[PDB]
Every structure is written in C-alpha cells, then in structure tokens.
Amino acid sequence: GGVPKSKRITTKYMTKYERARVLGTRALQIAMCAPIMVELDGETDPLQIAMKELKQKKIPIIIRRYLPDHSYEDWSIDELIMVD
C-alpha cells in the first residue's frame, strides 16, 4: 500500500519519536563500521556523529509511517525538517 509522494497527508516535521530511533539506529550503524557521510572533527562517540550528519540531512533512512487503516507513507530524512 505505497502512498504516492504527492498524496502524503502526514506531517512534514520529524517528531521526537522518529528522531530518537533514527539517531539510535544511525549510531548503531556507525558503531558497526558503516561509511560516514560527512566530515569529522575528532568526534569519537558515534551518537555525536549521528547528530552531526543529521544536521546536514545526510542519513539514508526511510521512515515508514503507518496510518491506522494499515496503509503506510514513506518519508526520507531530507524530506523532514528538524526542530528541537
């Protein structure tokens, strides 16, 4: 049940529950020796690198938001806009 990109009705803003699991999954990926999409300035804790490449929206995660009628909308990271 792939909803088209023009027909997405969910919010365009990443809430805290998406942010926590995206940061955790990306930190686990960097800790398991994935390539780092951005430059480095001496950060060693991979959760800091996870925020650092979340600022430039360079994280390859597709969030599959589930509507209550068991349909899903796929949103990229760069399609969402950070707020804190």
Binding site: Y17, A20, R21, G24
Partner: protein, 49 residues
C-alpha cells in the same frame, strides 16, 4: 541481596515507560535483559515443534 537477585521492574515502571513512549527501553528491560528464548514453531499448527 543474599541470593544476588536483580531489581523488580514492576507494573508501574512499565506504565510510565509506556507514558514516555520508549518502545526499545521496554523491549530491553522486559525481553532482552530478563529472559530471552528461541522456540521452533510449526507454521500450520502454531505450536511448539
């Protein structure tokens, strides 16, 4: 303490971890660091094989 036992992650802890909206902390404290197990299940009957 005398039997070297862990802490009781009771019902109210589960309640307020639901209230925090943290699914992974609940899955950790209630499946990962308490009693994980793997079972083999028949697809047709759904029972332990």
């Amino acid at each position: 303490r005398a039997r070297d036992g862990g802490l009781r992650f009771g019902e109210m802890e589960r309640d307020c971890q639901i209230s925090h909206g943290a699914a992974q902390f609940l899955r950790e404290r209630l499946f990962e660091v308490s009693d994980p197990y793997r079972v083999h299940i028949c697809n047709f009957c759904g029972l332990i094989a």
